[PDB]
Amino acid sequence: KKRPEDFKFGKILGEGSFSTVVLARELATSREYAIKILEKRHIIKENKVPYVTRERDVMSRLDHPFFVKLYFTFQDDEKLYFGLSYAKNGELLKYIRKIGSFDETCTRFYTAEIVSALEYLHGKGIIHRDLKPENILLNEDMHIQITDFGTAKVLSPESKQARANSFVGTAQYVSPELLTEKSACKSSDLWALGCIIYQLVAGLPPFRAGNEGLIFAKIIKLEYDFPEKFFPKARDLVEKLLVLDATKRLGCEEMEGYGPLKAHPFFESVTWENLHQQTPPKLT
Ligand SMILES: Nc1ncnc2[nH]cnc12
Numbered sequence: 058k059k060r061p062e063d064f065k066f067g068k069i070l071g072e073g074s075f076s077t078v079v080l081a082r083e084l085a086t087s088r089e090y091a092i093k094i095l096e097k098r099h100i101i102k103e104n105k106v107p108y109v110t111r112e113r114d115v116m117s118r119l120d121h122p123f124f125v126k127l128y129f130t131f132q133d134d135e136k137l138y139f140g141l142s143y144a145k146n147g148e149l150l151k152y153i154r155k156i157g158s159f160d161e162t163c164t165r166f167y168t169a170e171i172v173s174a175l176e177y178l179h180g181k182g183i184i185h186r187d188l189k190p191e192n193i194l195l196n197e198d199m200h201i202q203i204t205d206f207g208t209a210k211v212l213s214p215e216s217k218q219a220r221a222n223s224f225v226g227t228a229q230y231v232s233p234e235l236l237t238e239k240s241a242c243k244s245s246d247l248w249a250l251g252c253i254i255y256q257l258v259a260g261l262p263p264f265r266a267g268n269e270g271l272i273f274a275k276i277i278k279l280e281y282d283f284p285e286k287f288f289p290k291a292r293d294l295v296e297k298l299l300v301l302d303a304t305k306r307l308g309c310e311e312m313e314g315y316g317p318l319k320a321h322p323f324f325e326s327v328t329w330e331n332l333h334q335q336t337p338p339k340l341t
Pocket residue numbers: 070071078091125141142143144145147194204
């Protein structure tokens with residue numbers, strides 16, 4: 058292949074430090090895409106080529122309903138273009154802020170979608186490393202579409218790699234092992250999941266401060282509290298995820314993976330099959 062003139066560009070969906078995402082319609086098919094556009098001069102000058110390459114390589118591996126899809130890539134002299142699925146309802150974070158928190162049914166449903174997504178991702182040997190509500194988009198049907206793969210890692214199957222050495226993430230969601238051991242693992246995403254479940258119920262993530270270093274100090278000490286009213290089985294689940302030892306988090310490989318996590322009592326009423334076809338509960 059496609060070229061820019063094959064599309065009609067509409068509204069700007071997002072502006073980042075080195076990318077712009079624009080809604081577009083492909084003329085020959087009438088399909089809508091979110092097109093992420095990178096200016097080559099800028100990505101070269103600012104040493105972002107590895108992250109752009111990583112995003113393309115990781116997204117090309119993914120095929121599951123709970124991820125943003127990469128349908129095509131093309132470039133011209135100035136720019137690289139990634140054709141992505143359009144998530145019309147934007148970031149999960151927007152809904153947390155607006156409603157303040159989610160009821161139990163909605164927490165359960167969205168948590169189950171995230172767990173299903175992570176099961177798929179980790180089953181492919183990929184760590185996200187920057188899981189957070191801003192990176193969990195919502196499609197027109199209000200199912201999740203996880204994005205932001207330029208800081209993800211494909212663990213090498215040939216070496217049975219478990220640990221990744223790049224320092225990436227977001228302070229509120231970063232795992233203690235990355236801070237203290239300088240590496241992340243698949244279980245690092247389970248720590249982020251714990252933060253996210255907490256945030257859905259309480260309205261804010263559990264380790265928070267106006268300076269990143271203050272957050273790091275709390276993470277490494279497991280310094281957080283629950284508000285007095287927090288759904289008890291969700292509290293139990295969070296306490297099984299926000300564990301300093303990454304080999305002791307429910308869902309991790311050392312604990313036999315996603316079957317035991319899906320078996321947690323908080324999920325007793327979830328039907329895991331065809332979750333992407335179930336009608337999400339309305340957010341109120
Ligand atoms: N795929 C997408 N859909 C909607 N907004 C986005 N912002 C970044 N990627 C997006």
